Amino acid sequence: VALDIDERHLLRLGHGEEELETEGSFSKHGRVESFLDNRQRFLYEVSRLAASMGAPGAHGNSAETAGYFNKVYVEPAWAKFNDIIQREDVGPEDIVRAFPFHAYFSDAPQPLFPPEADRETVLEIANGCYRHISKIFEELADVLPFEILRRDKDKANYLLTSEARIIAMTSTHAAMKRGEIASLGFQYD
Amino acid sequence: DVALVCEDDAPYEQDILRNPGSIRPWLSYIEYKLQHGTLREQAFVMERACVQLPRSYKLWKMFRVNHISKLNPAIFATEYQKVNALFERALILLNKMPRIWEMYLKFLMQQPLVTFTRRTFDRALRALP
Numbered sequence: 263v264a265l266d267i268d269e270r271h272l273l274r275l276g277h278g279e280e281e282l283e284t285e286g287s288f289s290k291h292g293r294v295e296s297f298l299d300n301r302q303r304f305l306y307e308v309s310r311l312a313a314s315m316g317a318p319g320a321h322g323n324s325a326e327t328a329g330y331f332n333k334v335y336v337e338p339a340w341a342k343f344n345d346i347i348q349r350e351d352v353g354p355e356d357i358v359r360a361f362p363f364h365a366y367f368s369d370a371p372q373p374l375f376p377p378e379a380d381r382e383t384v385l386e387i388a389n390g391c392y393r394h395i396s397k398i399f400e401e402l403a404d405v406l407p408f409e410i411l412r413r414d415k416d417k418a419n420y421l422l423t424s425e426a427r428i429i430a431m432t433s434t435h436a437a438m439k440r441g442e443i444a445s446l447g448f449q450y451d
Numbered sequence: 452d453v454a455l456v457c458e459d460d461a462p463y464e465q466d467i468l469r470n471p472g473s474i475r476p477w478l479s480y481i482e483y484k485l486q487h488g489t490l491r492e493q494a495f496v497m498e499r500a501c502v503q504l505p506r507s508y509k510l511w512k513m514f515r516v517n518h519i520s521k522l523n524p525a526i527f528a529t530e531y532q533k534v535n536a537l538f539e540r541a542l543i544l545l546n547k548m549p550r551i552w553e554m555y556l557k558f559l560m561q562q563p564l565v566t567f568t569r570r571t572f573d574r575a576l577r578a579l580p
Contacts, residue, residue, distance in 0.1 A: 319505055319544050326578055330543040334536070410577040 269296060270404060273422060275431035275439070288430070290418040294408065297421075301325055301405035304398050308332060311395070314365035315339075325406035332399045340392060347385060354381040363391050423448050455495045459487065467503075474507050481513065494518045501537055505544035511551050514541075516558060524562055531562060546578060 263269070263284065274288035282288060286296065309322030312331065321331035339362045346352055346360045358375040367374050374391075375384045404425060411417040422429065423446055436443070456464060463480040470476055477500045484496040500510050514537075519530040538555045545551050552575045559568040 318503070321543070324546050326574070327543045327546050330539055334539060334543070407577075 267428065270300070270401070270425070271427035273426040273429045275422075275429060276435045290421075291414070293421065294414065294417060297405045297408050300401055301409065304328065304402040304405065307398055308402065311363075311366045314368075315362065325402045325409055328402045329399055329406065332395070332402075336392075336395060336399075343388065347388075354379065354384045357381060357384050357388065361388050361391070363388075363395065366395075367391055419446055422446070452495055455492045457488075457492075460484070460492075460496075471503065474504065474509065477504055477507070478509065481510070490518050498533075498537060501541065505540050508545065508548060511541050511545050511548060514554070520561060534558060549579060552579060 263272075263286065269286060270293075272288060273290070273293055276289070278289060278291070282292065286292065305322035305325070305328055308328040308331070309320070312319075312321040312335070315335060317331060317335055319331070321328055343360055343362065347357050352360075354375075361375075364374065375387050379387070407420060407425065408417050411420055429448075429450075460480070460483070463476070463483060466473075466476045467480060481493075481496060481500055484493040488496070494515075497510075497514055500507075501514060504510055516534050519527060519534060522530065524531050535558075538551075538558065541548075541551050542555065556568075556572060556575060559571045562568065
């Protein structure tokens with residue numbers, strides 16, 4: 263957690279009665295609760311971005327709906343921004359003025375684009391904003407598979423098999439659940 | 452699309468401008484376009500109603516793609532892409548609707564894209580009850 267490791271890809275295997283000394287619950291129920299909280303935060307952020315961009319409808323109602331609306335809105339907008347920045351006659355001021363996420367980034371510490379910043383720095387800032395939007399969309403899409411499954415055990419199995427990239431377990435827990443791990447189709451490198 | 456609206460639909464346009472979120476005026480305009488207007492004008496009015504009011508279940512259930520089903524999808528792929536975008540917007544607004552999902556599945560089965568139809572069927576199975 264102190265290093266650059268995502269909490270969504272981090273999971274812990276063991277008994278549910280053990281006390282978690284970490285600040286965040288790394289168990290299956292704790293990971294599900296953290297994913298639900300991240301999904302709610304991403305839905306609120308997507309609703310705020312849709313209100314700033316003037317997108318009609320409730321885009322923060324569901325994670326799949328948020329992903330579809332985010333694609334159908336941002337992808338033409340990001341393509342238009344990239345086409346405008348691809349022109350050789352477009353300067354840093356034109357690139358800053360053509361950014362469509364200025365209202366969404368208004369909550370950030372002003373200025374988003376410095377006046378002394380060159381075209382490269384403005385392009386880097388726009389790419390950082392687009393990467394933040396894409397990371398929010400990816401978090402919503404990752405939390406969508408948990409919301410699609412209804413059973414908690416099925417959601418935990420789907421998270422451990424595919425969604426989890428780092429899984430920490432004890433030797434006794436690995437030995438007791440070796441057959442379950444083999445039957446679940448979980449693969450490690 | 453400007454020529455698709457005539458003087459008869461001018462009162463309907465004024466009523467839509469006065470009340471942009473009225474389900475009854477939109478339904479009345481759709482019924483007037485279906486009863487008197489041409490197929491292209493009715494399709495344009497239905498597309499405008501779906502774009503303006505995508506959360507209306509009655510508008511989504513009464514949506515028809517019969518104006519593009521009679522054409523070859525290999526030559527009329529632009530109309531198929533527009534219908535796919537409209538269905539994506541409807542699924543963004545009405546993801547819990549089973550009738551809209553069935554209509555989208557039928558439209559995908561009409562098209563020859565096997566992988567896209569399989570992905571749509573998987574998404575419908577994962578997203579519905």
